[PDB]
Ligand SMILES: O=C(O)CNC(=O)C(=O)O
Ligand SMILES: [Mg+2]
């Protein structure tokens with residue numbers, strides 16, 4: 001079995017190997033990459049997402065989210081407080097202000113220490129989940145706006161035609177902006193490209209150990225757990241690496257830099273934070289190997305997690321028994 005310790009693997013495809021996305025994902029998996037839950041892909045040196053980032057300031061962040069924490073430094077929840085719209089130019093200026101900028105630090109490890117020590121005492125503003133793309137339409141390889149759709153994958157594997165579309169989303173981050181512990185909707189893959197700016201640190205639990213994370217989370221967030229059998233779908237819970245180590249949860253960590261892709265694999269729990277002003281683009285995707293995970297994915301039926309139009313059909317076809325109860329939560 002390849003990669004039995006479930007280490008995060010880093011790939012360096014040639015421009016020739018960068019031509020066929022599906023085939024490269026399948027290659028990564030042949031090397032055991034999926035066992036970690038997360039892989040890094042460094043694009044060939046000849047590749048570019050677009051020519052420059054000089055003209056992005058007039059993108060609108062219609063609902064910036066202020067991430068307010070509660071709890072203790074290692075174990076906290078965050079809620080998202082809606083703020084007034086601002087442009088990317090305005091947001092970048094805010095990220096760089098004295099109140100929100102990245103503090104002096106030695107290296108990534110020192111900054112990680114400062115994040116976990118100090119995250120809860122600040123409320124950074126996140127521009128999340130903005131429909132759109134920063135890939136040039138002439139970028140042919142690994143253009144997240146041109147991937148095959150999850151609906152076409154389900155049709156090709158299962159023969160059923162369903163409604164829904166699949167488009168990318170932009171994330172504008174600042175120091176301390178945080179992604180809580182989660183798997184993707186319907187335990188899909190995700191791909192994330194860091195277009196510009198400061199790095200993003202990731203933590204991930206191997207898929208084969210996801211239930212160990214879930215068990216800890218139910219112990220650490222006992223009221224949330226009673227309210228909903230899949231509360232990590234709410235994307236509000238944070239658990240530090242120190243706490244995971246104290247509780248013997250297997251995990252790994254890696255820092256993504258501008259110009260690098262990360263791939264999350266089905267049922268790979270992940271969480272992380274941004275180092276400073278940045279812009280990432282991400283999209284969910286599927287492969288044949290996803291199907292069985294989609295069939296077994298937990299669902300939030302308490303009504304908090306409130307998810308896309310396209311998830312309907314996935315639950316309807318892959319999880320017909322759940323459908324009824326899940327749609328009662330979604331309506
Ligand atoms: O970039 C972020 O804030 C979080 N991204 C993801 O969880 C992802 O790409 O799966
Ligand atoms: Mg613009």
Ligand code: NI
Pocket residue numbers: 182183184190264270
């Ligand atoms: Ni994710």
Ligand SMILES: [Zn+2]
Pocket residue numbers: 227228229230231233234300301302303304305
């Ligand atoms: Zn729920």
